Amino acid sequence: NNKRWYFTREQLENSPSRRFGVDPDKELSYRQQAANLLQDMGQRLNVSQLTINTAIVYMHRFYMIQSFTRFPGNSVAPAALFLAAKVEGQPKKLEHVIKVAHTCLHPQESLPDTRSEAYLQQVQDLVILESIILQTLGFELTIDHPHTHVVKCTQLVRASKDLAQTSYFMATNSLHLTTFSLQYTPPVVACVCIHLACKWSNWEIPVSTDGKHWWEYVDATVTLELLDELTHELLQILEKTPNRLKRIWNWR
Amino acid sequence: DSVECPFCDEVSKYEKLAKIGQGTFGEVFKARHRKTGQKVALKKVLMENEKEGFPITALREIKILQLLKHENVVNLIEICRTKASIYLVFDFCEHDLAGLLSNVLVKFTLSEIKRVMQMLLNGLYYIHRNKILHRDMKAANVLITRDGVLKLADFGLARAFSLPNRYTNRVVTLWYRPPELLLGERDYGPPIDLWGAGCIMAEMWTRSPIMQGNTEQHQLALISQLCGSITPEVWPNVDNYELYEKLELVKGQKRKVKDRLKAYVRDPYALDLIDKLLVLDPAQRIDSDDALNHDFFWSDPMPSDLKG
Numbered sequence: 400n401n402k403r404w405y406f407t408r409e410q411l412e413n414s415p416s417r418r419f420g421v422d423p424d425k426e427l428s429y430r431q432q433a434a435n436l437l438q439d440m441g442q443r444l445n446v447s448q449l450t451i452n453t454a455i456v457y458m459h460r461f462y463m464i465q466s467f468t469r470f471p472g473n474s475v476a477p478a479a480l481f482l483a484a485k486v487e488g489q490p491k492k493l494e495h496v497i498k499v500a501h502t503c504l505h506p507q508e509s510l511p512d513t514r515s516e517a518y519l520q521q522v523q524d525l526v527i528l529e530s531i532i533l534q535t536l537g538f539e540l541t542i543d544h545p546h547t548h549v550v551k552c553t554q555l556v557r558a559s560k561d562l563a564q565t566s567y568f569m570a571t572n573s574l575h576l577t578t579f580s581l582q583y584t585p586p587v588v589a590c591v592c593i594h595l596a597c598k599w600s601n602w603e604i605p606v607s608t609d610g611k612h613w614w615e616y617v618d619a620t621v622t623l624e625l626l627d628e629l630t631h632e633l634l635q636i637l638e639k640t641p642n643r644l645k646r647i648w649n650w651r
Numbered sequence: 652d653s654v655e656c657p658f659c660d661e662v663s664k665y666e667k668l669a670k671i672g673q674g675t676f677g678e679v680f681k682a683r684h685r686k687t688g689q690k691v692a693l694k695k696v697l698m699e700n701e702k703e704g705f706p707i708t709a710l711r712e713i714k715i716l717q718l719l720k721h722e723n724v725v726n727l728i729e730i731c732r733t734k735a736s737i738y739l740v741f742d743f744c745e746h747d748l749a750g751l752l753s754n755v756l757v758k759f760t761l762s763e764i765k766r767v768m769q770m771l772l773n774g775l776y777y778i779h780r781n782k783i784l785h786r787d788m789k790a791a792n793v794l795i796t797r798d799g800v801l802k803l804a805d806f807g808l809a810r811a812f813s814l815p816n817r818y819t820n821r822v823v824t825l826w827y828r829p830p831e832l833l834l835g836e837r838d839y840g841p842p843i844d845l846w847g848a849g850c851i852m853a854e855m856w857t858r859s860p861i862m863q864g865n866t867e868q869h870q871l872a873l874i875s876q877l878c879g880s881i882t883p884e885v886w887p888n889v890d891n892y893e894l895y896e897k898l899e900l901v902k903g904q905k906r907k908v909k910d911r912l913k914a915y916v917r918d919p920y921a922l923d924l925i926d927k928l929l930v931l932d933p934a935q936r937i938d939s940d941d942a943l944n945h946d947f948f949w950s951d952p953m954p955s956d957l958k959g
């Protein structure tokens with residue numbers, strides 16, 4: 400449905416991984432780390448942040464159905480990224496992706512002979528895993544990301560380049576750091592990002608002549624109660640993330 | 652080793668009745684849902700390779716079928732796996748326009764031909780409005796349901812478009828392929844599908860593909876012998892085509908579209924619309940919106956439901 404890949408908090412506690420004894424906090428790390436692997440490979444493979452985000456969402460959803468105990472993120476991430484690049488029209492060659500993943504996960508080891516048995520197996524493994532991803536996602540690969548909506552929203556409130564860049568930053572970090580993509584629609588998340596960027600910059604968007612707040616123009620459901628609740632959550636994990644905040648911190 | 656799989660059902664839920672796809676189109680089966688009797692079409696995803704996992708071409712089609720939801724566009728119900736391979740499952744369509752037309756027993760009234768063209772053009776309007784080019788407009792890809800509803804089918808070569816594009820030139824079956832492509836254009840749009848609708852419209856009376864080339868040059872010759880010859884006067888700027896000097900086509904031809912089809916197509920409006928579909932310059936070629944507005948659909952006999 401339109402409810403298929405969105406989950407209640409209770410559903411999120413009962414993840415496939417919990418059912419195999421993985422703590423909640425541990426599981427969030429497993430996500431975070433996969434998203435990091437995706438970011439790292441994606442940048443080395445020279446694919447867009449959009450494609451990385453698509454792979455990241457695939458990853459999120461994949462693990463609402465599968466367990467980290469059966470499928471380790473170091474296995475899924477490359478397959479997920481391989482797929483996302485195909486889907487997003489920046490196809491990267493299978494060998495290339497295997498190679499980059501190898502250096503990422505084993506900087507010090509050395510790539511096997513592309514003629515070897517060991518290598519041929521890992522080529523086959525990735526292809527198999529791409530297939531388990533497709534099947535897990537029921538071939539639903541068209542992803543909507545908050546960012547499209549960020550640009551829309553930050554223009555229709557005349558934000559500086561800076562504010563807009565920060566809002567896009569939040570958006571991307573929401574994918575790496577939170578399960579918001581599994582709980583809230585892209586446009587709602589975008590409001591959360593613009594909210595936090597504002598709070599962080601000491602920018603306030605003045606109430607419209609009608610008495611309507613900016614976010615109402617973007618999503619009928621959205622409430623300041625919810626925005627404050629969510630920005631709080633997102634900001635917390637940002638604080639926990641070494642160096643992330645530095646990137647948008649006004650040092651002047 | 653037996654993984655959870657809530658959203659991808661095994662194709663064994665369907666019971667194969669019959670191949671209907673041999674040769675080119677791929678393996679296509681008629682099937683029956685084992686519980687409800689619901690008839691469907693199964694297309695397997697061919698893995699001649701890939702060297703590259705799940706075919707990017709199949710991903711594209713799946714993306715496009717999932718986007719397109721309309722009475723005149725074939726309906727992808729779901730994608731199924733197998734107890735490794737993959738099947739696209741569609742609502743079944745009883746007829747196929749190519750079969751109907753190649754069947755001497757089957758007979759269309761002017762009224763029904765109007766209806767067919769109306770549904771087809773309305774399907775095109777929808778897919779284009781949704782930024783999709785079908786790129787394989789031809790009678791054999793047009794289905795009709797037991798209840799007389801036309802569906803555009805086979806999105807396997809279709810592609811999203813936008814607004815200097817470098818789309819692929821090797822698109823559309825040769826007999827239905829528009830001048831632009833034959834002259835090497837890679838920045839083309841919706842007009843290529845409409846040229847094809849033209850060829851199909853004419854085919855509703857001639858019961859046979861009007862222009863059956865053997866090579867691109869033969870095709871361009873046939874096209875010239877019908878639509879006049881490619882002239883910068885007729886087609887402004889047809890100049891800057893590499894293959895333009897190099898084409899060695901005709902030079903004296905004049906538009907015979909209405910004369911050569913005058914025989915088969917009684918109705919004047921019909922001939923006028925076909926003429927406006929088979930226009931050489933893609934930019935002067937009628938679009939689905941105007942075509943739907945054409946008097947052919949708004950004069951007697953008005954379009955009627957299908958039963959022949």
Ligand SMILES: CNc1nc(C)c(-c2nc(Nc3cccc(N4CCCN(C(C)=O)CC4)c3)ncc2C#N)s1
Pocket residue numbers: 671672676679692693694725726741742743744745746747749750791792794804805
């Ligand atoms: C592009 N080929 C096609 N793929 C699918 C999945 C098709 C399809 N077909 C039907 N029903 C149907 C009924 C009668 C004939 C056909 N033809 C057989 C004769 C014509 N033909 C060619 C190449 O000339 C091929 C198929 C098909 N119903 C639903 C779908 C769908 N989707 S057609």
